[PDB]
Amino acid sequence: FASVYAWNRKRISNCVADYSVLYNSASFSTFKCYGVSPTKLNDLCFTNV
Amino acid sequence: GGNYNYLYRLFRKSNLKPFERDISTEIYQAGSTPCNGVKGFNCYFPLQS
């Protein structure tokens, strides 16, 4: 991974993304969602990530 | 110093019927991992100040 003043920025578009597998992973120390509840990402969706 | 006697519930299984009050303070199975009375991971207390 890169540094904090040179953080890596990635664009995601035109694919199906399964957030359930990441949400069920226990290796993440912190998993905080502010705008929306983590449960309902698989229902609503946007045009870019 | 910050008062914390004022609580609100953020996690619930479903919505509320009109004119209904719920005071059930029980751990919520946020993720696929069962809680079994222990928060651990993927379980959080519904109420916070």
Swiss-Prot record, chain A:
Changing L22I: In strain: Omicron/XBB.1.5, Omicron/EG.5.1. Changing S29F: In strain: Omicron/BA.1, Omicron/BA.2, Omicron/BA.2.12.1, Omicron/BA.2.75, Omicron/BA.4, Omicron/BA.5, Omicron/BQ.1.1, Omicron/XBB.1.5, Omicron/EG.5.1. Changing T30A: In strain: Omicron/BA.2, Omicron/BA.2.12.1, Omicron/BA.4, Omicron/BA.5, Omicron/BQ.1.1, Omicron/XBB.1.5, Omicron/EG.5.1. Binds to host ACE2. RBD also interacts with the N-linked glycan on 'Asn-90' of ACE2. Cleavage of S generates a polybasic C-terminal sequence on S1 that binds to host Neuropilin-1 (NRP1) and Neuropilin-2 (NRP2) receptors. Interacts with host integrin alpha-5/beta-1 (ITGA5:ITGB1) and with ACE2 in complex with integrin alpha-5/beta-1 (ITGA5:ITGB1). May interact via cytoplasmic c-terminus with M protein. May interact (via N-terminus) with host bilirubin and biliverdin, thereby preventing antibody binding to the SARS-CoV-2 spike NTD via an allosteric mechanism. Attaches the virion to the cell membrane by interacting with host receptor, initiating the infection. The major receptor is host ACE2. When S2/S2' has been cleaved, binding to the receptor triggers direct fusion at the cell membrane. When S2/S2' has not been cleaved, binding to the receptor results in internalization of the virus by endocytosis using host TFRC and GRM2 and leading to fusion of the virion membrane with the host endosomal membrane. Alternatively, may use NRP1/NRP2 and integrin as entry receptors. This is Spike protein S1. It comes from Severe acute respiratory syndrome coronavirus 2. The lineage of its organism: Viruses, Riboviria, Orthornavirae, Pisuviricota, Pisoniviricetes. The chain holds residues 347 to 395 of 1273 of the full protein.
